Amino acid sequence: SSASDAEFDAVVGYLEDIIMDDEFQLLQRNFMDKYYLEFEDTEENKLIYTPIFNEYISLVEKYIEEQLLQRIPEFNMAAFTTTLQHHKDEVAGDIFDMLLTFTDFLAFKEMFLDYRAEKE
């Protein structure tokens, strides 16, 4: 520690909580639930996967911050990021390794293919 090394660690607490919740599965289910159709099971990717992929990311993180303050009011994502984004290399944990799974495109394509397969 000492002083707002807590703040960060207390935010980490939820970077498990929030994303391990079955409510996180919903917004995904729901977002995927409007393009089952437009995800072909071929190795060549559609030019339109990328714009959907970017909407997906800006929804995951848009949800994460509007959930971090549903619990920690007076929480600032831009302040959290900046500092975290260097001055606490208490990063690196089996924690954000989870959180950047959403940046992996092929892991996104694969899980998206599993969804169209499921409702067919």
Partner: protein, 189 residues
């Protein structure tokens, strides 16, 4: 936001992002395929993009091949982000559109989202009788006299898989040596 920055801060050290671009028909998808030892006898012109994750010389290389059709080139820059190396593939036989190859390349070198990538130019379809000599492709495209990026020309045949390795082998030497000076200047400051 967060996830986009997070990934760019704890990015894998020996993971390289390779973007393959160039006019249609050039042989981009042919190269990718004839690299993993896949069948080239099935390749239809790409309207989207192929990603072929592949290991070589201790690196794992995430190679993106994007469709080169004229109506798809606007959307090319959705893949500029985080590019470690830019593979420009040239159909050295279609000399009529070599004029076009110069314009599209000179517009890529000044993109600032690609500002760091190392430039590998593939003078493909060298097996063809109509194929221009690498040096004639060098004065064309105005390859030299570009104070933007580190570059190398490589005349190759993607069907036989000739000279595809000498190019990628060079690319890493450049990229890794660029990452050498990263650590060197990092720790000493």
């Amino acid at each position: 936001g967060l996830l986009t920055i997070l990934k760019k801060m704890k990015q894998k050290e020996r993971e390289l992002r390779l973007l393959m671009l160039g006019l249609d028909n050039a042989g981009k998808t042919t190269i990718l395929k004839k690299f993993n030892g896949e069948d080239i006898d099935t390749i239809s012109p790409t309207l989207g993009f192929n990603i072929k994750t592949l290991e070589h010389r201790g690196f794992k290389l995430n190679i993106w091949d994007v469709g080169g059709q004229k109506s798809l080139r606007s959307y090319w820059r959705n893949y500029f982000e985080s590019t470690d190396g830019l593979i420009w593939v040239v159909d050295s036989a279609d000399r009529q559109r070599m004029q076009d190859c110069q314009r599209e390349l000179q517009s890529l070198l000044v993109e600032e989202r690609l500002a760091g990538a190392t430039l590998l130019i593939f003078a493909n379809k060298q097996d063809l009788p109509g194929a221009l000599s690498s040096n004639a492709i060098r004065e064309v495209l105005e390859l030299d006299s570009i104070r933007s990026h580190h570059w190398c020309i490589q005349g190759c045949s993607a069907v036989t898989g000739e000279n595809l390795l000498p190019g990628i082998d060079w690319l890493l030497d450049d990229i890794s040596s660029r990452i050498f000076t990263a650590d060197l200047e990092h720790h000493h400051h």
